[PDB]
Design a protein around this nucleic acid. Structure first.
Ligand SMILES: [Mg+2]
Ligand SMILES: [Mg+2]
Ligand SMILES: [Mg+2]
Ligand SMILES: [Mg+2]
Ligand SMILES: [Mg+2]
Ligand SMILES: [Mg+2]
Ligand SMILES: [Mg+2]
Ligand SMILES: [Mg+2]
Ligand SMILES: [Mg+2]
Ligand SMILES: [Mg+2]
Ligand SMILES: [Mg+2]
Ligand SMILES: [Mg+2]
Ligand SMILES: [Mg+2]
Ligand SMILES: [Mg+2]
Ligand SMILES: [Mg+2]
Ligand SMILES: [Mg+2]
Lengths: 104, 220, 62, 252, 106, 53
RNA sequence: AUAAUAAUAAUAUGGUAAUAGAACAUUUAAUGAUAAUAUAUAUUAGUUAUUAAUUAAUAUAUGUAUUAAUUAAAUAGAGAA
RNA sequence: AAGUAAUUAAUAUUAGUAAAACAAUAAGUUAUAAAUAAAUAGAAUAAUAUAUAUAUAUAAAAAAAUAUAUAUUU
RNA sequence: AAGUAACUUAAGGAUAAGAAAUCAACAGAGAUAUUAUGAGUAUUGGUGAGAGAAAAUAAUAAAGGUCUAAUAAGUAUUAU
């Protein structure tokens, strides 16, 4: 099991190291000071009241998610609900067709 | 002795290059083929410089436009398929359709299939194959010939990425552990084409979800 | 490397082993002339063999 | 009635004797296909291969200074008129004795030509076939294949000398001596030799080094058409020969 | 599958210098895809058509003679056999006829 | 063929071995090629001058 | 049904600009016997329908042709600036 | 002491392979279908053009142009 | 012609660039640099002279991601 984990791609492994799955990170935006602050969401800083940009910028987050999908390790990553990105089959199914497609 | 000191080119391969400015009896003597004394003698005028008259790239009006939205399909005639079958190169298991990927594999179509394949009817008389075909589209006559043979055509939509995936699914698996999903037709023209029963478009023939959704939207 | 003469490309299009072009003299001053006579100038025209070589040199990738 | 009376099926396998190295002793025959070892000797193809290879080999270091490259000033030496002498510009002109060269090359000159891969393969086969015909293609092996006659006690099936690196008594060593003895036996002292190995035979090349000017030890991958043809007698490993055949076979 | 077969399976007639293939006999090998090597060629700027026949093993002269016998309708003059590469050129587009003649044996 | 080579002292080439189908043929070949050269060393084939008379 | 050489009959063979075909000298690279009775260069006189090479004599060098030949190439040929 | 080199395009001759070629990692270029400004069009319904394909035109033909078809695809 | 020659200034062993307010197109990719194809294609021009991408696929390449910022205002945007 440990060997299989080690065999995972580098970026994914790094992510797991620095945001581990024992902590249930929040689905919604949170305080930046919070422990359960989602790195994919923009969390608000409590003093200044300014939204900090996500700790994992959107491309990196997407890459991480794709890696998780590849190796079946999605649920151990923190939730990507309130980040607007969907991926692959879920994206395909859930999306509404454009107004131009349905109503030319 | 080694052959290495007795090798010649094949007769008719090589030539002596015309060597100028190297004596009178050579032929290409002092003037070196230039003629005598003009601009072309010692300098450079352009080959297509017409003298000052309005040139043949100016007299005439500029015509047409380049349709950048165009995506030219590679044409495959029924005749070629028939020939392949006769030669026993058309390897198909029963039930397996002769798709664009399959055609490429076989060597029916060859070179890069960028946008798709159209099936044309240049040997529709001697076509007698009951196998099922699937391409970007087919000629009406070709379709009729296929039907007569006891075959079954389906015009299938493929975006360039989707087409590529279809042709070489293993590459995508190797790279990413997952072949990409086949796109819906976003364009209006594309939707219209595959919604035609006369074209044997996949949206009507398979009774697709997109078409139904469009109909529902129209109703509402 | 060599490149296409863009004006020539705009004027001339390929037709097998020749080039086709539009006719000159049908952009203004058409009124007064016979319409039947003018219909000669409406279509396209194949390149004359005199300037075929020139056209080839202008359009190396055609 | 009979359409093509003289039609027939050609022969497809030539026997090459598999030998033990130090002393070229027949161990077995091995039927290599006719296309590799007994093609009709087409000179034109061979020529094409050789010239192409030679062109590839070129260093192309010719670098004479043109009138720009040459290092004089740009100043006009004598005024256009009123000098009583011929018209001159700068001192770099090809016309003058210290000036730069006209139409000067500039290194590194690229002399690389191309060849179709199939043509090259055909040439490679052809050279090998020619060598076989001559009686200058010594296939050494017996490790993989099933033998008829057993290998000798002091020979070995691969193309190498034993205990070459060992040198305890005197400065002279044994592998060199063995090589010299071999040369003496087969009457090829001054002749060009070409040892086509499969893997790096370090001891063999050490043994050769005395006769480096005539003996060329090459790998299976880096062997050339030129190398094969120049050779007065090639000494190829069976495995290496197999590999070459596989490489330059016409695909089906 | 194996490039060099074993010594047992190879017959004597399969070897070189057996069955007399050189003397007045020939073979015409098919292409990779499995077709007869007979081709139209449009030389001198599409002006000179000629039919080329490739991949001939053995005696080309004999083969040419046999083809002439088969096709008397083509003249005797128009059969140029180039000896360096061993291929036999015919003047017209006489490809299909040649193929028909060859098919039965090759 | 190996035996013949060993007794002879000379090497019969691989192509030749492939070609010749009988002992008689081998003998004839030997008589043709090696024998005269063995008899007279000036008559022997030289490599650098292959077209010698 | 070809190639080389030689016969016979016929026709053709002045040439600037130009086009086409075929050779030679020189230098380098690949292959490469041989040897002071030899090789190279020069001079003189012979020879071969001869920008070339060869024979002999004479001279000077060298223990010796990147030699003959086939290929690959060129800073490849000078009474004209 | 003077027609040279590089990157390209078009012809020709030969050689390799050939309905494919080059390349083999895929990708690409050329060929395999002719057109048309362009479009969702594209080559015998029962044979040589008197048939068919495309562009103009049209209900569909005819008409101009080019192309495609008479054991084996070029 | 050319942001070339030149002059001027400033740095380092290299500099520059670099982990998307990027591309793409309803499928997707995943920093930058250099090269090959894409392609002399799209694009543009007193529509003359001429100029001319990108996506995508390959190589070369290194572990290539990673916080150092309390997440940014006379800024984005607009007019000129
Ligand atoms: Mg002249
Ligand atoms: Mg004048
Ligand atoms: Mg003059
Ligand atoms: Mg002039
Ligand atoms: Mg009139
Ligand atoms: Mg060359
Ligand atoms: Mg004359
Ligand atoms: Mg000179
Ligand atoms: Mg002089
Ligand atoms: Mg003179
Ligand atoms: Mg209309
Ligand atoms: Mg500018
Ligand atoms: Mg830096
Ligand atoms: Mg920010
Ligand atoms: Mg911000
Ligand atoms: Mg502004």
């Amino acid at each position: 099991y440990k060997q299989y984990f080690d065999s995972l791609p580098l970026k994914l492994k790094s992510f797991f190291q620095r945001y581990p799955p024992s902590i249930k990170y929040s689905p919604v935006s949170t305080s930046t000071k919070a422990i359960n602050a989602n790195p994919f969401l923009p969390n608000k800083h409590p003093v200044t009241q300014r939204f900090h940009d996500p700790k994992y910028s959107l491309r990196r987050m997407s890459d991480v998610y794709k890696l998780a999908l590849r190796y079946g390790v999605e649920e151990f990553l923190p939730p990507i609900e309130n980040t607007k990105k969907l991926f692959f089959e879920e994206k395909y199914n859930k999306k509404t067709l454009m107004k131009g497609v349905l109503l030319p | 002795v080694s052959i290495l000191g007795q090798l010649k080119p094949s007769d008719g391969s090589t030539k002596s290059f015309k060597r100028l400015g190297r004596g009178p009896s050579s032929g290409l003597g002092k003037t070196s083929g230039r003629g005598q004394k003009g601009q072309k003698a010692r300098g450079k005028v352009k080959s297509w410089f017409e003298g000052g008259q309005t040139p043949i790239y100016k007299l005439f009006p500029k015509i047409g436009f380049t349709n950048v939205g165009a995506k030219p399909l590679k044409e495959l005639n029924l005749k070629r398929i028939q020939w392949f079958h006769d030669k026993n190169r058309l390897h198909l298991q029963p039930g397996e359709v002769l798709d664009m990927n399959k055609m490429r594999k076989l060597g029916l179509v060859t070179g890069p299939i960028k946008y798709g394949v159209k099936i044309l009817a240049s040997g529709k008389f001697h076509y007698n194959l009951p196998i099922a075909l699937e391409a970007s589209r087919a000629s009406a006559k070709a379709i009729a010939a296929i039907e007569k043979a006891g075959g079954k055509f389906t015009a299938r939509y493929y975006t360039p990425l989707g087409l590529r995936a279809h042709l070489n699914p293993q590459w995508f698996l190797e790279k990413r552990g997952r072949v990409p999903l086949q796109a819906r037709p976003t364009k209006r023209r594309d939707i219209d084409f595959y919604s035609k029963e006369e074209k044997r478009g996949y949206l009507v023939m398979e009774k697709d979800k997109l078409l139904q959704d469009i109909k529902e939207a129209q109703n509402k | 490397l060599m490149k296409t003469h863009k004006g020539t490309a705009k004027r001339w299009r390929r037709t097998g082993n020749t080039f086709k072009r539009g006719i000159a003299g049908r952009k203004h001053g058409n009124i007064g002339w016979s319409h039947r006579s003018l219909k000669a100038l409406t279509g396209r025209k194949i390149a004359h063999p005199a300037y075929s070589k020139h056209l080839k040199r202008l359009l190396p990738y055609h | 009635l009979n359409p093509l009376p003289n039609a027939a099926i050609p022969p497809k396998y030539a026997l090459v004797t598999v030998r033990s190295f130090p002393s070229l002793e027949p161990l077995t025959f091995v039927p290599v296909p006719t296309s590799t070892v007994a093609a009709p000797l087409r000179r034109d193809i061979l020529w094409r291969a050789v010239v192409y290879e030679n062109d590839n080999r070129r260093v192309g270091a010719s670098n004479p200074p043109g009138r720009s490259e040459n290092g004089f000033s740009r100043r006009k030496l004598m005024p256009q008129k009123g000098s009583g002498r011929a018209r001159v510009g700068d001192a770099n002109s090809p016309t003058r004795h210290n000036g730069g060269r006209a139409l000067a090359r500039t290194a590194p000159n690229d002399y690389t030509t191309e060849l179709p891969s199939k043509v090259y393969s055909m040439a490679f086969n052809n050279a090998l076939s020619h060598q076989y015909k001559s009686g200058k293609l010594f296939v050494i092996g017996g490790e993989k294949v099933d033998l008829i006659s057993p290998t000798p006690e002091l020979d070995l099936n691969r193309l190498d000398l034993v205990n070459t690196n060992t040198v305890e008594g005197k400065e002279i060593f044994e592998g060199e001596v063995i090589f010299r003895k071999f040369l003496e036996e087969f009457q090829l002292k001054g002749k060009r030799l070409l040892f086509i190995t499969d893997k790096t035979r370090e001891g063999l090349i050490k043994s050769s080094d005395p006769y480096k000017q005539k003996v060329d030890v090459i790998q299976k991958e880096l062997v050339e058409v030129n190398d094969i043809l120049r050779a007065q007698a090639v000494f190829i490993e069976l495995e290496a020969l197999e590999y070459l055949a596989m490489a330059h076979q016409k695909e089906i | 599958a194996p490039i060099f077969p074993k010594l047992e399976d190879v017959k004597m007639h399969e070897l070189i210098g057996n069955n007399n293939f050189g003397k007045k006999t020939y073979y015409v090998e098919r292409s990779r895809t499995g077709n007869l090597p007979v081709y139209s060629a449009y030389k001198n700027g599409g002006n000179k058509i000629i039919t080329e026949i490739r991949k001939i093993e053995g005696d080309v002269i004999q083969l040419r003679n046999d083809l002439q016998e088969q096709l008397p309708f083509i003249p005797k003059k128009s059969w140029s056999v180039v000896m360096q590469s061993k291929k036999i050129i015919i003047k017209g587009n006489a490809v299909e006829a040649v193929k028909r003649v060859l098919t039965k044996k090759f | 063929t190996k035996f013949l080579q060993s007794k002879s002292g000379y090497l019969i080439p691989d192509y030749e071995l492939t070609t010749l189908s009988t002992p008689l043929q081998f003998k004839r070949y030997i008589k043709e090629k090696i024998l005269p050269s063995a008899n007279d060393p000036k008559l022997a084939y030289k490599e650098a001058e292959p077209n010698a008379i």
